[PDB]
Design a protein around this ligand. Structure first.
Ligand code: HEM
Ligand code: HEM
Ligand SMILES: Cc1cc(CCNCc2ccc3c(C)cc(N)nc3c2)ccc1C#N
Ligand SMILES: Cc1cc(CCNCc2ccc3c(C)cc(N)nc3c2)ccc1C#N
Ligand SMILES: C[C@H](O)[C@H](O)[C@H]1CNc2nc(N)[nH]c(=O)c2N1
Ligand SMILES: C[C@H](O)[C@H](O)[C@H]1CNc2nc(N)[nH]c(=O)c2N1
Ligand SMILES: [Cl-]
Ligand SMILES: [Cl-]
Ligand SMILES: [Gd]
Ligand SMILES: [Gd]
Ligand SMILES: [Zn+2]
Lengths: 404, 404
């Protein structure tokens, strides 16, 4: 039972929950690879064992373990799989599982919210046109005029034989990335290839560096088809700074809904290759990673010139200055636009509050220190000073091969 | 079957083949990662097997592997263990061994410099008194009027029949920390304990915030003897801000020389429980950590208030702005005072070049990601976007329990 220490306060806890971890990670006694982005690189009696485990923790969570429908529910799943091969989750189960998977995501710092999540059951989806509308309710419910609300939309569970439901964008909202003669990129370089894939599937390209990509929706077997997004659904926030009057002129924007459409949801041994979830942003996500990363928008030097900073020596800390202002402008702009956004201090502190809750409840909490600590001011936040154990619980969100 | 490691800023891929030589064992299993633990740790035949390895490394590096002088040294060593249960390092072997320990230190961002290390051989040392003299000398050579040099002093190896040489002080230069009427601490809270010890061993405490502590030096089978550092030996840098003239009225200071004095040095099974070593500071250790940590000097709010920042709300990023100014002061005061210092941007850049040097050389490089990334501006620096393999090689520096 790992002794975990907090070094800011001197407190000590034990992670007993780690004990019940299953799907083995990447690390060994001889070398730690906790800093890898992809940990686990990418006869049906394995289905049942995973299934009984989820069902047991389901009834555990409602007290009704032992006797009652608990006893009963084990048989239905048993018989279902015995007959069919796969099984269907009761609707309440699918809601329980989806929340658990969130609660088990080690790299997410928003888990203090894990209990408040809106699940939309689209297991009766059957078409790309059908997927599209489902996506469009979600985005509408999630966005909610900038009063953002955590939502997941679950599409049919992958079944033995015959193809998957899948979304080809990594997110629902993505800006375009265009190559050229230079080999450089106008727009967002993170989305250069999916822009490549859009155009070659019949999308008329665009102007420049904030062009919302269209979706690519893949119904089982049948190849993908584009689906243009309604401009009013895709809520955005133009970027201005509270005191640096020139910032708006730079013409920076960013969307309101972070919504991931490529990760694979697993509950009770069932794989959902299409299960888009959305929450709301932490400001450093936009201000530090998306706009400042050398391989993203890389705007840091442009902001620094306009601030008339000394970019000639790295010891003026012009990078650190520019970056704080780019962050101040993000929080400001989202607030002016009355769109839900959380700063990193506010967020990390709430995560600490989550760790203590998760101690009392489950005897621990799987966390990925490198992803929980923010990309700026790491040591200024409490989670820097907090030892963390990382492991894999089910249900969870996994990564999956892209469909190319 | 060697770890694939990717640089996410540039897209580079390399495999860490050096990790498969990992001579000791870390805290991680495939069930759970524990890389965020500060303390990831805690017979003649084994002393031989460690020793043979070191000797092998040594004769590899002088391009004289598998030769007369090599097999000589093996036979000589494994026969000296027979007669005494120990063996002695030749001086050249000691110098190579001290560098390697630095080279292998996974938590050191300044390893680009590993080859330029001045090794003082004090294995003939005889008392706590000769010990003090050797230390004063180390401080004098290393400080060098503000133009700092890397050195290490190696006191006599742990041996059968005798007690250890031990320096009780975590670092050669440390500020006192005094408990209070409030129950609070005056000066540096990291050194409340050592301060307690010094006082009880006859030191006459001051009452300032930057009272330099005396040394407690332990010669074999002797109580620790207390030694005052000659004031003119301890070069300090008074902290001022280049455009916030009220800053100098904080009365903040720091010392030039980061000399760690309580770590064990391990060479071919031989253990040196006293071998103080020193480099020069990276500005964040002073700016971010030593001053802004809530549990250290904790000046963050007091600076931010003085900056007339709005400390009511976190979304104002008051913590981040105040921190960036504290760092700017550190780099500036030190540059003014003509006292060597490196910024985290410059530091992280040379570390990347180190990783590149190391891959060509040994096919890899041990690195603790969460230590390498600066406690501010992580993603702004290149080490944020680099995956790293953590493992233990020998020679090495290790933590060791306090002798009290
Ligand atoms: C509601 C507010 C939320 C906040 C503030 C939040 C915060 C974050 C942040 C900052 C990340 C880092 C991702 C990155 O930097 O690339 C993250 C990742 C993640 N979040 Fe949350 N999140 C929220 C909602 C949700 C919801 C609703 C779910 C699932 C239903 C979720 C599950 C995840 C997962 C699985 C990851 C890992 C992403 C990956 O590995 O690519 N989060 N979260
Ligand atoms: C010359 C410039 C040097 C720089 C800029 C530098 C930088 C650093 C920094 C920033 C840390 C982390 C400190 C902390 O987080 O508390 C560290 C740790 C460490 N460094 Fe270096 N260093 C230098 C020289 C040296 C030398 C000369 C040695 C040994 C011969 C060394 C060996 C180590 C070791 C063993 C650690 C781990 C200390 C621990 O675990 O507490 N470094 N270094
Ligand atoms: C595997 C991978 C992962 C990532 C990170 C993607 N995760 C982004 C994300 C995903 C979900 C979020 C959610 C749900 C909320 C939020 N505030 N931010 C979120 C951010 C980037 C590139 C790769 C790659 N290759
Ligand atoms: C185990 C432990 C470790 C640390 C880390 C302290 N390391 C300090 C250090 C040690 C050597 C340095 C060197 C050699 C150079 C440099 N710039 N900074 C250095 C800083 C702090 C508290 C504890 C505790 N308890
Ligand atoms: C190699 C390293 O793990 C990688 O760059 C990680 C570090 N931490 C991160 N943390 C978050 N939230 N998002 C990221 O993309 C990354 N990148
Ligand atoms: C618990 C946590 O890992 C701990 O506070 C670490 C994080 N990374 C660090 N990195 C460095 N360089 N120095 C440190 O003291 C720490 N502290
Ligand atoms: Cl994003
Ligand atoms: Cl220090
Ligand atoms: Gd101007
Ligand atoms: Gd001024
Ligand atoms: Zn690990």
């Amino acid at each position: 039972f790992p002794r975990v220490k907090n070094w800011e306060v001197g407190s000590i806890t034990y992670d007993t929950l780690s004990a019940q971890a299953q799907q083995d990670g990447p690390c060994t006694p001889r070398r730690c690879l906790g800093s890898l982005v992809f940990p686990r690189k990418l006869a049906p009696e394995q289905l049942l064992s995973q299934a009984r485990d989820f069902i047991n923790q389901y009834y555990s969570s409602i007290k009704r373990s032992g006797s009652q429908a608990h006893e009963q529910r084990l048989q239905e799943v048993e018989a279902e799989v015995a007959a069919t091969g796969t099984y269907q989750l009761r609707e309440s189960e699918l809601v329980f599982g989806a929340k658990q998977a969130w609660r088990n995501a080690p790299r997410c710092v928003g888990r203090i919210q894990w209990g408040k999540l809106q699940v939309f059951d689209a297991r009766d989806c059957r078409s790309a046109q059908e997927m599209f509308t489902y996506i469009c309710n979600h985005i509408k419910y999630a966005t909610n005029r900038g009063n953002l609300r955590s939502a997941i939309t679950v599409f049919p569970q992958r079944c033995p034989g015959r193809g998957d439901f899948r979304i080809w964008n990594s997110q629902l909202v993505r800006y375009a990335g265009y190559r050229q003669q230079d080999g450089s990129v106008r727009g967002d370089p993170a989305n250069v290839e999916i822009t490549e894939l859009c155009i070659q599937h019949g999308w008329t390209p665009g102007n420049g560096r904030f062009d919302v990509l269209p979706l690519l929706l893949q119904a089982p077997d049948e190849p993908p088809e584009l689906f243009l997004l309604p401009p009013e659904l895709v809520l955005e926030v133009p970027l201005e700074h509270p005191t640096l009057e020139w910032f708006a002129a730079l013409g920076l924007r960013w969307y309101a809904l972070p919504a991931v459409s490529n990760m694979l949801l697993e509950i009770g041994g069932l794989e959902f290759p299409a299960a888009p979830f959305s929450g709301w942003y932490m400001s450093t996500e936009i201000g530090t990673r998306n706009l400042c990363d050398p391989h993203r928008y890389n705007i840091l030097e442009d902001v620094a010139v306009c601030m008339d900073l000394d970019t000639r020596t790295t010891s003026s800390l012009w990078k650190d200055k520019a970056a704080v202002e780019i962050n101040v402008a993000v929080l400001h702009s989202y607030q002016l636009a009355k769109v839900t956004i959380v700063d990193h201090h506010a967020a990390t502190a709430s995560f600490m509050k989550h760790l203590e809750n998760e101690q009392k409840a489950r005897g621990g909490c799987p966390a990925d220190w490198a992803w929980i600590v923010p990309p700026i001011s790491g040591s200024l936040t409490p989670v820097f000073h907090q030892e963390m154990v990382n492991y894999f619980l089910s249900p969870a969100f996994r990564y999956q091969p892209d469909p190319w």
